Amino acid sequence: SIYAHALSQFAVCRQPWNEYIGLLTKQDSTPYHTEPQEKPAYRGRKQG
Amino acid sequence: KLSVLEAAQSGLTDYFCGGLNFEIVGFELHMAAMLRERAAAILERSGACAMLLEKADEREVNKLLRDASRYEDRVDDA
Amino acid sequence: LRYPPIYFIVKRCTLYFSEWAYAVKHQLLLQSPFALRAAFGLLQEVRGDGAAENVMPLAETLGTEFKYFTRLMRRPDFYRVGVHTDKSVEKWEEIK
Amino acid sequence: LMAHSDTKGIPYFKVDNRGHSNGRVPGVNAPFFGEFDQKMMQAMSRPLN
Amino acid sequence: NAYAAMELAAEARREIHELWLSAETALEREKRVQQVAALIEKYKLDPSTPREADVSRGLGDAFDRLLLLCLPLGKTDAKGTDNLERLMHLAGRNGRELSVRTIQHLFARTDSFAEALAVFYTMRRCHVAMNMEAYYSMLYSLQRLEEEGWGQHFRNEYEENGAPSEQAMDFIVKGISNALLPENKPWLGRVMFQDRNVPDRRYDTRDFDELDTAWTQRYKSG
Amino acid sequence: QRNEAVSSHEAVPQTPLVDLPGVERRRDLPADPITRLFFQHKGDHALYYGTYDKPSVQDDDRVQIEKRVP
Amino acid sequence: EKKRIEARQMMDGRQALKKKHLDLLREFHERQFFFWYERASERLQNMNL
Amino acid sequence: ELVAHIVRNYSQIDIIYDFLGFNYSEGYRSSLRRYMEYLQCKTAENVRASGRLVTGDKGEHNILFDYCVSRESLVSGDSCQGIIDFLYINGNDVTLIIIASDNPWLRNRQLPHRRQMEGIARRVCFVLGIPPSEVRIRNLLLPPTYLDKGSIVRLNDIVFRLSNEQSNLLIPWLTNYNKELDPKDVDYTALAKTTNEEEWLTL
Amino acid sequence: ANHPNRQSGIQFLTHYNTHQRFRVNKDYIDYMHWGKEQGQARLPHRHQRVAFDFNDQLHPTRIGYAWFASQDPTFGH
Amino acid sequence: HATYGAVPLTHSQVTSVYATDGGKVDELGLLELVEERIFSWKLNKWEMRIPPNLPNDQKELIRQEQENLKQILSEWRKCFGALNA
Amino acid sequence: TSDESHITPYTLGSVAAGVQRLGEHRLRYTLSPWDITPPEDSVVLKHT
Amino acid sequence: DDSDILRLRAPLTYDMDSTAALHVPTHCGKASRLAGMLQDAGGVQVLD
């Protein structure tokens, strides 16, 4: 676009939803984060 | 229950929908203008829907004009 | 130049009213006068009086916009000039 | 240790031809515009036309 | 302190531009070469000069045009190849990397083959890490040397005849027989998906200036 | 087809009008590059393609199914 | 007959393309040769010592 | 009667008969160069024909070069881009005349890359001694199987410079010749634009 | 199938040249050390799977962010 | 029809074979007269026209251009029929 | 009266990115700037 | 010129601008139906 700059000054950026939803106050929050342990898997018809 | 219309874009385009395609419309408007040009050229060449005193000139003038109006009809259709 | 140059761009974190107005006038001058005035006429024709009744409904508005569009598109201004206005840069390079 | 050289690596030398095998790819090579379809919903659809 | 070094460097680039903007037949190969050597020995552009009070730091972009002002190497001595390797060595100290644009015009500046090799060897001694740009710019330069040779041959035999042979014609059309990096298949000479041929022809001073002035105008407007 | 053929019928059999360089390329079906089973390959590349027996190198990031033989 | 002329149109196209692929492969090998020389030179320099 | 009349009036009618695609084998190429050679011979005062190259005795540049047949030489060997048919040098203007291939695949390459035009330009500059300041090198690519009015007009008017009256003098039959592009053949001119990172896929 | 060396089963959903997993001479599996992340040791590894679950992610597209400039500025990898 | 001794003609021998001087010729009278006679033919009139002694490839070429001349001429026949109607 | 202007985004977003982006149009030296210059002592080059 | 924009406001005739009025909903439904309706009415009548 050789010329369109007139619009460029009052033009508007797109808003930061990723971190806004990241930093929302959450009810699972913990002072120190622990990764969950491993869940039981399915080892086949004999093992369960 | 619900019919959802959206834009399918493979990452090539950030538009949901454009307007009329202005390239097409501009194109055929230009063509129509050019045919009116040639038709006027020969109308004033013999003058030196158009009804004349010469069969050849009536022929080609009317062909030109008809085609022009067809183009304009495509724009109008758009 | 006595010394090697550097090239800075300077962004303003604040627009003033005068500044903004300068921008918007710089655009109004940058587009076809006939269609500026025309479109003003069209807006004030749809708007009508401005009362909730006098505004055109959708069916009349599409028709009105059509009337103006149809009348303007004929002019060399739109098809010969303005249509190719918005082309990308590489398009103009390929055409040149 | 055995291979350590003053000449910088392959990437600096740009020895390779080709590139991504599909040519221009919005995610990888070129820029990406518009919206992410994370489920494959738009990627398999039937042309209605 | 070093502010003085930079000032004297300002006078330096003033007269570098002075002789660059000349670009006249009044400046002959011999004259340009010895004028350049004169500048270097005036302003102490040797690598022996300490880090501070190094004049080559404050030459913005006049360094490259001073650099390719060396290139065609006059017929006196093999001394010439040293001027070049002085300049480059300083860059090596200072930290300024050589732009591919600069070395491309550097090869485009070369008159004969031994000189092209002279340059490549010189930047071998100067600890330049060879890229694909280096190699392809060199090859291009060889190719244009041969193309130039044949162009000379056919215009020559056209002169003593008055109408071209068919060899002259198809040389004009398809270029050099069995060229390396040829035109008819453009996709070969490419590096990083951009075609590399600057070096395939000569450039005047005003060509170089045209490109960077274009850049400047683009800044001042867009 | 019959009813709408008669509907559009004019008296003179008019010549086709010249159009844009083309509008008639069959479009490429949309797919997302980033999350993919496979890349949607252009039909513009139709020269590059191989057969079921001897496939051209493509979709490298994905495992290639093998032909099943006795 | 029409089917055959367009069949050989596509065939000629493909054979042309694998000619082009051939040139590309040659020049790929050339490139990685230059690089090879950059490393191998460097090693033999050391072996001279 | 009618055929006698045809022969007596239309001298070049074999040329025309070829321009209309009625030569199904080896068609319309040779008649084009017979035509161009005729045009040049009536344009200039002296014409030598040496093999595939035609020159003027003038000392000013008039040159017609029959280079390759771009039909076979295109699909035959060394897949390339800028394969052309004729070269015509009018003085400071140079013109590459190309006959479009019938492969819609193989057209996209056929007309020369910009690098090839730079090359040809400065090569002519070396050989003919023409000033590199003023050189204008252009392309003309004609329809594959036949020849329309548009192509002949821009062959007469631009490549050779012929004002309407000297053309109407030299070529009477152009007025009666109405042939235009068929719908199937319209797009031979418009060519696929391919990216540089895409070069491994498409020609 | 109770025969040893036939335990890997009948899987069609592999990429190999036989639909019978136990005739395949390419990748011999390891029943003791394998299958932490994939469940059973018979089944194909996370990266070789040619069939995909509803709520499971499918394969990553390899690169080998610069190109997201048009997107949400915060949007991460 | 085609007989032993028939040759496909080049332009020069067509100019040689039919060369007759006469002044008054209506292009548009004669053209339509000949046209009319060709539209009066039945399809068997196209049958024996290929020259008897030729190499087979060349024969194939002549067959092609003959069939295209006939196809074009009939394609024009019906058009003219409608026009006249 | 003033207002917050939406900054039109930069291409590279950081200066380091600026240098690296600029650096692909250039040729790296084999040796870093501080060791190019020969030492004041003399290092006899042996085999490794 | 002002008189030209005054002209824009006039309703569409076929004498000036050679285009029929748009009226949209009728065109939306009945555009493809028109041949049918017309021939049900026994075709048009060309009067003088």
Side-chain angles (χ1 to χ4, degrees):
Chain A
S1 57
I2 314 179
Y3 75 104
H5 329 304
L7 304 86
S8 180
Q9 242 24 263
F10 44 88
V12 183
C13 171
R14 54 188 317 184
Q15 295 296 306
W17 283 99
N18 210 359
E19 73 167 358
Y20 179 85
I21 299 181
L23 294 174
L24 235 35
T25 295
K26 295 174 185 294
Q27 47 179 357
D28 208 0
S29 290
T30 308
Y32 297 92
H33 191 229
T34 304
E35 284 68 15
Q37 300 296 313
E38 54 128 8
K39 318 173 74 59
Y42 179 80
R43 309 302 180 189
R45 70 160 168 85
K46 278 191 277 69
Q47 307 289 342
Chain B
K1 320 202 180 208
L2 186 60
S3 300
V4 178
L5 164 64
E6 73 175 27
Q9 47 208 7
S10 28
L12 308 174
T13 298
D14 32 340
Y15 286 60
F16 163 76
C17 185
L20 296 91
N21 198 143
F22 272 171
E23 187 174 9
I24 308 182
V25 170
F27 173 82
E28 50 182 4
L29 282 180
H30 197 86
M31 302 286 282
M34 288 183 49
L35 293 178
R36 309 269 176 199
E37 284 180 1
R38 303 219 260 108
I42 200 158
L43 247 189
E44 299 301 335
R45 187 273 308 173
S46 84
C49 280
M51 304 185 186
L52 291 175
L53 279 67
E54 292 289 351
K55 184 57 172 183
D57 317 24
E58 218 186 42
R59 180 164 283 124
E60 52 206 350
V61 162
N62 285 326
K63 178 170 185 55
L64 258 58
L65 290 180
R66 192 178 70 245
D67 288 358
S69 59
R70 294 176 68 204
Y71 275 116
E72 264 131 8
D73 280 333
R74 291 179 55 177
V75 191
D76 178 276
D77 192 40
Chain C
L1 302 170
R2 192 153 60 90
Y3 294 118
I6 21 166
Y7 303 87
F8 293 138
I9 66 145
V10 169
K11 299 201 165 168
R12 291 177 266 94
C13 297
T14 304
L15 288 190
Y16 282 180
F17 191 11
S18 66
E19 219 130 3
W20 178 85
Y22 186 97
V24 72
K25 182 183 176 193
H26 188 87
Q27 192 166 347
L28 281 191
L29 293 183
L30 194 43
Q31 42 200 49
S32 70
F34 197 67
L36 263 186
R37 215 110 110 52
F40 184 83
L42 182 256
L43 162 67
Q44 86 177 10
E45 162 168 353
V46 167
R47 221 189 210 136
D49 175 43
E53 141 66 22
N54 298 258
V55 166
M56 290 185 176
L58 190 56
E60 278 75 346
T61 294
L62 256 41
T64 302
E65 287 187 336
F66 179 81
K67 178 181 67 178
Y68 277 60
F69 198 100
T70 286
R71 292 211 172 107
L72 293 195
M73 55 155 44
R74 292 285 174 137
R75 306 184 51 255
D77 192 311
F78 166 74
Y79 68 80
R80 190 155 195 150
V81 170
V83 155
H84 306 108
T85 266
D86 57 340
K87 278 193 196 309
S88 67
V89 188
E90 61 249 37
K91 239 296 188 164
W92 276 117
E93 190 55 39
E94 278 192 344
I95 281 176
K96 278 179 249 197
Chain D
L1 277 210
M2 286 301 97
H4 163 107
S5 203
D6 52 350
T7 159
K8 281 61 183 303
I10 279 340
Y12 164 86
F13 198 86
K14 40 221 62 168
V15 37
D16 87 308
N17 274 162
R18 208 163 167 93
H20 187 73
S21 64
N22 193 16
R24 185 184 186 84
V25 169
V28 188
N29 303 151
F32 190 90
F33 301 90
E35 284 304 309
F36 301 107
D37 189 31
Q38 302 219 12
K39 321 294 183 182
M40 280 209 39
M41 233 221 51
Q42 91 168 325
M44 46 189 62
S45 42
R46 184 152 168 154
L48 297 185
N49 187 12
Chain E
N1 285 326
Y3 186 57
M6 297 287 96
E7 283 185 19
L8 113 111
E11 263 72 20
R13 39 176 296 166
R14 192 253 303 140
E15 66 178 2
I16 290 181
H17 290 351
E18 161 176 17
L19 108 140
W20 167 263
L21 291 171
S22 282
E24 300 124 3
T25 307
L27 183 80
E28 290 304 353
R29 207 165 168 186
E30 191 260 316
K31 287 212 50 57
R32 183 192 53 259
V33 168
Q34 71 168 8
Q35 272 197 22
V36 167
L39 289 205
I40 295 181
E41 291 317 310
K42 180 176 185 177
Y43 285 145
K44 317 265 95 178
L45 290 179
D46 311 336
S48 292
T49 295
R51 279 291 180 92
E52 62 289 358
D54 187 30
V55 187
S56 81
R57 183 170 81 99
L59 310 161
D61 90 80
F63 187 79
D64 27 302
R65 61 185 66 261
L66 172 68
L67 180 48
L68 40 78
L69 210 32
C70 293
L71 213 278
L73 297 186
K75 195 79 63 184
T76 308
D77 193 359
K79 69 186 172 187
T81 186
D82 99 317
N83 276 319
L84 190 72
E85 57 78 29
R86 275 201 286 267
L87 278 181
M88 280 184 169
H89 260 307
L90 258 65
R93 268 198 300 159
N94 199 24
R96 62 164 56 220
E97 306 193 341
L98 279 179
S99 75
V100 292
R101 192 267 197 90
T102 283
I103 76 158
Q104 266 170 345
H105 287 272
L106 195 57
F107 279 98
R109 215 77 201 295
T110 313
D111 291 328
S112 78
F113 158 67
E115 287 190 2
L117 201 58
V119 174
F120 196 81
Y121 280 179
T122 285
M123 48 188 292
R124 228 81 160 93
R125 288 153 200 161
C126 271
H127 324 274
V128 186
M130 287 317 176
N131 199 2
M132 262 297 141
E133 274 87 4
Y135 283 72
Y136 276 2
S137 71
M138 169 108 193
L139 293 178
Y140 270 154
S141 67
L142 303 180
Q143 192 176 6
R144 86 142 150 80
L145 285 187
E146 188 169 17
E147 182 173 11
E148 186 177 346
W150 279 100
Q152 191 48 237
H153 173 42
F154 283 131
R155 98 156 295 152
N156 205 1
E157 98 168 355
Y158 165 87
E159 289 299 331
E160 58 81 30
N161 185 18
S165 62
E166 64 277 36
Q167 290 87 10
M169 291 310 290
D170 60 23
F171 158 79
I172 278 182
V173 169
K174 68 175 180 48
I176 296 174
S177 72
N178 202 3
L180 70 193
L181 302 179
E183 312 154 352
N184 59 342
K185 37 179 86 167
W187 50 80
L188 293 195
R190 282 160 178 177
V191 164
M192 198 167 259
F193 310 112
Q194 314 165 19
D195 39 9
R196 284 294 97 171
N197 59 323
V198 193
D200 41 319
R201 34 85 49 105
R202 293 293 189 286
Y203 291 87
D204 195 276
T205 286
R206 293 179 196 168
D207 299 338
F208 208 80
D209 284 22
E210 159 180 346
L211 198 60
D212 62 38
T213 306
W215 189 98
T216 279
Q217 290 318 302
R218 174 158 189 183
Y219 170 88
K220 285 170 178 182
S221 55
Chain F
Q1 271 166 31
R2 178 161 66 81
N3 156 33
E4 74 179 333
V6 180
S7 297
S8 310
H9 180 68
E10 301 190 2
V12 306
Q14 295 179 347
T15 172
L17 250 30
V18 35
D19 284 330
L20 278 190
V23 283
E24 275 321 304
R25 305 164 193 178
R26 223 173 167 196
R27 301 302 194 285
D28 278 355
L29 282 178
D32 194 274
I34 278 140
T35 290
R36 65 143 176 52
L37 281 220
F38 298 111
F39 287 121
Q40 183 69 55
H41 297 275
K42 282 70 198 165
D44 308 328
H45 306 341
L47 265 29
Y48 180 78
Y49 297 159
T51 50
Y52 176 75
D53 276 336
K54 290 192 189 311
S56 53
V57 35
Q58 48 185 357
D59 282 309
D60 154 58
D61 336 358
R62 272 44 179 162
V63 191
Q64 180 184 4
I65 283 192
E66 285 172 7
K67 279 180 294 72
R68 296 223 161 97
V69 297
Chain G
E1 175 79 1
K2 198 184 68 59
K3 295 293 115 195
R4 84 149 259 269
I5 64 182
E6 51 189 10
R8 82 122 191 284
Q9 287 181 355
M10 179 129 318
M11 296 190 199
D12 296 353
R14 246 115 60 144
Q15 200 272 331
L17 191 77
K18 71 175 168 279
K19 284 180 193 163
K20 185 179 175 191
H21 282 285
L22 210 282
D23 295 332
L24 259 357
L25 186 77
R26 172 165 304 118
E27 97 131 0
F28 174 91
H29 276 56
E30 298 174 4
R31 282 176 166 229
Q32 77 183 4
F33 177 85
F34 287 152
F35 183 81
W36 175 91
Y37 168 80
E38 280 306 324
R39 287 176 67 53
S41 69
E42 187 278 335
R43 292 302 164 204
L44 297 184
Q45 310 281 357
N46 188 28
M47 189 158 82
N48 209 339
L49 272 52
Chain H
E1 272 102 62
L2 186 48
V3 164
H5 177 81
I6 270 173
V7 162
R8 198 165 57 261
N9 289 23
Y10 302 67
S11 67
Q12 324 198 51
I13 199 179
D14 54 323
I15 282 177
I16 310 181
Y17 172 77
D18 291 333
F19 279 167
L20 288 182
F22 283 82
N23 208 19
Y24 301 81
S25 56
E26 195 187 14
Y28 130 84
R29 211 290 191 107
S30 286
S31 59
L32 175 80
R33 71 93 46 86
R34 291 183 51 246
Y35 172 84
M36 277 190 295
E37 210 182 336
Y38 167 85
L39 229 37
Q40 173 182 25
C41 279
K42 295 310 177 299
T43 302
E45 72 287 350
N46 285 318
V47 170
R48 310 154 160 167
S50 67
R52 57 186 198 143
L53 171 55
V54 151
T55 51
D57 296 52
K58 199 170 192 168
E60 176 251 314
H61 306 113
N62 197 338
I63 288 173
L64 185 59
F65 191 48
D66 178 14
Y67 180 50
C68 292
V69 197
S70 62
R71 183 127 288 175
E72 63 263 19
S73 187
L74 185 49
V75 306
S76 77
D78 235 336
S79 81
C80 285
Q81 176 146 26
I83 300 169
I84 62 178
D85 285 286
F86 295 89
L87 183 51
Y88 184 81
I89 301 179
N90 214 339
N92 295 120
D93 306 331
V94 182
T95 308
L96 309 165
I97 300 185
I98 311 178
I99 306 182
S101 59
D102 42 355
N103 300 344
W105 291 103
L106 236 17
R107 282 176 203 148
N108 293 319
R109 290 341 284 254
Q110 211 176 344
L111 84 182
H113 186 50
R114 64 154 173 78
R115 181 181 154 185
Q116 272 190 60
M117 314 206 68
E118 296 175 340
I120 291 189
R122 62 193 168 70
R123 243 167 300 141
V124 155
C125 289
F126 298 158
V127 167
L128 286 188
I130 218 165
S133 166
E134 52 252 12
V135 178
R136 195 169 45 96
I137 168 174
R138 304 170 92 180
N139 282 333
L140 207 217
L141 102 83
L142 319 174
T145 169
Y146 63 91
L147 211 46
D148 54 327
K149 255 225 105 308
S151 293
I152 293 195
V153 170
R154 76 190 62 153
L155 187 38
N156 283 350
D157 186 35
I158 298 228
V159 186
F160 317 93
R161 264 73 56 98
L162 289 182
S163 69
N164 293 329
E165 62 274 342
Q166 49 177 336
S167 77
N168 298 142
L169 194 188
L170 288 167
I171 302 171
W173 49 265
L174 255 182
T175 310
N176 307 329
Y177 179 100
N178 287 341
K179 176 90 176 204
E180 65 202 36
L181 283 187
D182 298 339
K184 64 166 209 313
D185 251 345
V186 177
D187 287 320
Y188 77 108
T189 284
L191 292 172
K193 274 84 187 80
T194 68
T195 339
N196 309 117
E197 63 264 25
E198 190 259 5
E199 287 302 308
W200 270 78
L201 299 173
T202 316
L203 294 169
Chain I
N2 266 356
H3 178 46
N5 77 41
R6 286 188 184 180
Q7 290 307 315
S8 53
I10 215 56
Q11 327 138 339
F12 277 90
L13 290 184
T14 55
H15 72 275
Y16 304 107
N17 64 350
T18 314
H19 70 289
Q20 304 166 356
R21 180 67 179 87
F22 45 88
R23 310 271 180 175
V24 177
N25 52 30
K26 278 171 50 177
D27 299 327
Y28 299 88
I29 73 183
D30 183 336
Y31 287 88
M32 298 184 52
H33 308 275
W34 272 15
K36 181 195 183 182
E37 40 84 355
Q38 29 160 10
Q40 325 179 12
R42 326 157 46 248
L43 314 170
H45 309 270
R46 292 313 304 306
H47 56 284
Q48 292 177 335
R49 38 204 244 286
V50 313
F52 312 89
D53 280 328
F54 280 93
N55 307 98
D56 189 22
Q57 301 212 4
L58 45 82
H59 294 314
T61 288
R62 171 192 265 281
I63 298 174
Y65 198 68
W67 311 118
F68 281 167
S70 182
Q71 290 304 324
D72 176 17
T74 307
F75 187 98
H77 286 169
Chain J
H1 286 82
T3 43
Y4 178 87
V7 185
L9 289 163
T10 69
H11 174 70
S12 307
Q13 42 198 17
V14 165
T15 302
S16 78
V17 160
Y18 320 73
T20 296
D21 292 326
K24 186 62 170 191
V25 191
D26 311 344
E27 297 180 330
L28 296 190
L30 265 198
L31 195 61
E32 288 174 7
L33 216 38
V34 172
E35 255 174 276
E36 173 191 18
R37 179 55 79 192
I38 294 179
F39 301 161
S40 292
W41 288 346
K42 300 167 134 306
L43 285 183
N44 45 88
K45 276 295 178 182
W46 297 86
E47 280 179 15
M48 260 164 61
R49 306 300 173 184
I50 299 148
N53 309 47
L54 277 183
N56 254 33
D57 53 4
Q58 198 185 342
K59 237 191 192 214
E60 294 175 23
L61 284 184
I62 251 177
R63 286 193 84 92
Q64 188 177 345
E65 49 184 3
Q66 268 199 11
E67 196 60 26
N68 289 309
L69 278 168
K70 163 198 194 191
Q71 208 253 358
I72 288 175
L73 235 26
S74 52
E75 293 177 350
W76 168 252
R77 155 193 296 153
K78 58 176 65 68
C79 194
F80 180 92
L83 218 60
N84 205 352
Chain K
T1 321
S2 89
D3 176 29
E4 180 60 38
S5 63
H6 302 264
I7 300 300
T8 166
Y10 303 116
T11 307
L12 264 34
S14 40
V15 162
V19 180
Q20 260 62 252
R21 177 62 173 268
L22 178 52
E24 57 185 14
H25 300 283
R26 298 184 179 177
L27 293 182
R28 273 62 177 293
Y29 291 110
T30 273
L31 266 4
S32 58
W34 45 92
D35 34 22
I36 293 212
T37 57
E40 56 264 32
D41 302 320
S42 67
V43 191
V44 187
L45 256 187
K46 280 79 177 187
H47 185 220
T48 324
Chain L
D1 188 69
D2 184 72
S3 57
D4 307 334
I5 301 154
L6 253 308
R7 269 174 205 83
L8 278 175
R9 294 194 87 275
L12 277 168
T13 77
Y14 201 80
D15 279 319
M16 285 65 241
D17 9 42
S18 166
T19 305
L22 181 58
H23 174 69
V24 29
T26 284
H27 165 88
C28 169
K30 300 293 188 177
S32 44
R33 289 315 181 106
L34 199 70
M37 316 169 63
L38 259 306
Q39 97 162 343
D40 275 347
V44 284
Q45 314 182 21
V46 44
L47 261 167
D48 36 343

